[PDB]
């Protein structure tokens, strides 16, 4: 999508939806775009300890650099201190690495997905530019604004005159993973092949593949 | 007629100075009063004008270096020479097409020789002179100054002349400012005059 200077094609669109107990981060599985699709497997998602899992998406080259870098940080906080790297500690940490990718320019958006010690389940967007914030609905990857809208209606439910929230259930999120990617396939066939759904309850990672026909 | 607008006229027993207060972001003056007149001493005054931001960075680096001369000798440095000295440093920076060029106005009193005033362009030219102004404001006053006064003219007439000049900027110039600071210098020191 993004200009050649670290790319010639990468695609991959990710959606992630916050309930208030689980966060499922769904991404298409396949490594695509050049002019055709290169490969059918690749691990975008990595759990650094058991309590933080990052999934980085867009170019598979950026994803391989940034994820290993996210593993490195967990080792740095354990050695330096003695602790397990929580959600906040990782989210903040990603920004230091992200500083590098501002004169370089990227549209690879890495998303740390976990449970935070604030009483809820968390999905964090740091932008690939910099900045970090927490959110109730989010679209991240090669377009950071094409997945985003479906979640805006379904999760947030701020459609009165005013803004009042009302997160959805776990069962509603699973169906949201399966459906979104098929919808996005119509629009941009850069979400294709197989849908990989990762579920993070912030104390475990589980995976589900499903083929797309 | 160069960049931003400043004017100072020494009569060699008085110095008349006014400078704009306006570090403008977009189309509003985020504050009304803004410092463009800096005091290195109570008997040296530097009025820097050009870029809002560039004026400040240039002044502070030289200012710790100025202090260093004061620290060692524990008497006054040669102030005329120090305002030239920064200029020589800006001649080395001038070969580079980067803009760091400052239109400066030195008012200083030196001990032994007397008062010195030096003019600095954005093309960088040191002159002791009867009155000089920087940017558009040089343009505004230089032509009346031969005719309407002398280089020994009275403080009253100077001030009336200055008031009118600042009103001509609001009236004629595309750069008006409704806050200008006026300061009057006798033969040795700064007095803060009424804002207009």
């Amino acid at each position: 999508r993004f200009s050649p200077y670290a790319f010639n094609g990468g695609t991959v669109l990710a959606i992630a939806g916050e309930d208030f107990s689980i966060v499922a981060s769904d991404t298409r599985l396949s490594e695509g775009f050049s002019i055709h699709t290169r490969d059918s497997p690749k691990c975008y998602k990595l759990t650094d300890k058991t309590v933080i899992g990052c999934s980085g998406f867009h170019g598979d080259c950026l994803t391989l650099t940034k994820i290993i870098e996210a593993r490195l940080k967990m080792y740095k906080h354990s050695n330096n201190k003695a602790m397990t790297t929580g959600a906040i500690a990782a989210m903040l940490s990603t920004i230091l690495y992200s500083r590098r990718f501002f004169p370089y320019y990227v549209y690879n958006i890495i998303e740390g997905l976990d449970e935070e010690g604030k009483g809820a389940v968390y999905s964090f967007d740091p932008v690939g530019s910099y900045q970090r914030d927490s959110f109730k609905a989010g679209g991240s990857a090669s377009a950071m604004l094409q997945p985003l809208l479906d979640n805006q209606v379904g999760f947030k439910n701020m459609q009165n005159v005013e803004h009042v929230p009302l997160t959805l259930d776990r069962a509603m999120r699973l169906v949201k993973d399966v459906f979104i990617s098929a919808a996005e396939r119509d629009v941009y066939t850069g979400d294709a092949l197989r849908i990989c759904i990762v579920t993070k309850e912030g104390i475990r990672e589980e995976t589900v593949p499903l083929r797309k026909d | 007629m160069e960049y931003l607008i400043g004017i100072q006229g020494p009569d060699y027993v008085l110095v008349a100075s006014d400078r704009v207060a306006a570090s403008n972001i977009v189309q509003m003056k985020d504050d009304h009063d803004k410092m463009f007149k800096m005091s290195e001493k109570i008997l040296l005054l530097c009025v820097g004008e050009a870029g809002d931001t560039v004026q400040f960075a240039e002044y502070i680096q030289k200012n710790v270096q100025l202090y260093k001369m004061r620290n060692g000798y524990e008497l006054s440095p040669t102030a005329a020479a120090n305002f030239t000295r920064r200029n020589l440093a800006d001649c080395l920076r001038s070969r580079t097409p980067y803009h760091v060029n400052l239109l400066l106005a030195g008012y200083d009193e030196h001990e032994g020789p007397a008062l010195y005033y030096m003019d600095y362009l954005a093309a960088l030219a040191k002159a002791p002179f009867a009155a000089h102004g920087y940017g558009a404001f040089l343009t505004l006053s230089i032509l009346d100054r031969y005719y309407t006064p002398t280089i020994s003219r009275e403080r009253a007439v100077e001030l009336l002349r200055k008031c009118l000049e600042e009103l001509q900027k609001r009236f004629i110039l595309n750069l008006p400012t409704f806050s200008v600071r006026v300061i009057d210098k006798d033969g040795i020191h700064n007095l803060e005059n009424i804002t207009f």
Partner: protein, 246 residues
């Protein structure tokens, strides 16, 4: 910083040979007393060694590190003159002071200078070519709170707040002579602080107010080094007074 032996080797005393040797090197920069007033914090130095073929500026133990922090030096000994080794601590101290003005533009703090200096001396130990220091400074200056400060530092790396401290010719001895002279009136009255500094210097030096040069520094105004001639006028009255407290 290049040598081929260690600069110091440790002892089971728990003293550093080079810091103690340095303390004598700083009493080369003769006796300095400083007292803290309500609004004028004043320090004065011993010997200007006047022969009216010299300049007064060049021998100074009073050094301007900034235009709102100043210091006078010594510590303990009785050893020979030389401004120079002390002068070198000043040259480091003046950068240290100036770098802080870049960082915080308000009148820079006394505390910063003293702390930087203690650590600076330990650091020189570590480098084999670098000569350590061990000095005391009478740091005078003002905060951004406008309140008077007089701080003093020691070769032991430790800095304390004080209302009056003197250093030179026995650090504890000039300090104790001031402890007697101190009363509660002294520090608020502007006039009274000046007389304290002159009685302490007048002890070790003959015919002061030519060998007493003192500077007052102010909340609003920078360093003013007074002419010696106006100081002599004080010395004559004050020496009358000095015998009285004894």
């Amino acid at each position: 910083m290049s040598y081929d032996r260690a600069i110091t080797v440790f002892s089971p005393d728990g003293h550093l040979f080079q810091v103690e040797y340095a303390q004598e090197a700083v009493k080369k920069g003769s006796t300095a007393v400083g007292v803290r007033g309500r609004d004028i914090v004043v320090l004065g130095v011993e010997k200007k060694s006047v022969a009216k073929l010299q300049d007064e500026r060049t021998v100074r133990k009073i050094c301007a590190l900034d235009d709102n922090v100043c210091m006078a030096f010594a510590v303990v000994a009785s050893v020979s003159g030389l401004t120079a080794d002390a002068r070198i601590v000043i040259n480091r101290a003046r950068v240290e002071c100036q770098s802080h003005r870049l960082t915080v533009g308000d009148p820079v703090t006394v505390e910063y200078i003293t702390r930087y200096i203690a650590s600076l001396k330990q650091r020189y130990t570590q480098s084999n070519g670098r000569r350590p220091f061990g000095i005391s400074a009478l740091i005078v200056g003002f905060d951004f709170d406008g309140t008077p400060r007089l701080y003093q530092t020691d070769p032991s790396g430790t800095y304390h707040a004080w209302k009056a401290n003197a250093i030179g010719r026995g650090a504890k001895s000039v300090r104790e002579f001031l402890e007697k002279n101190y009363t509660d009136d002294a520090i608020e009255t502007d006039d009274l602080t000046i007389k304290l500094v002159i009685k302490a210097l007048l002890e070790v030096v003959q015919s002061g107010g030519k060998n007493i040069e003192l500077a007052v520094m102010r909340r609003d105004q920078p360093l003013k080094i007074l002419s010696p001639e106006e100081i002599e006028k004080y010395v004559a009255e004050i020496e009358k007074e000095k015998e009285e407290n004894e």
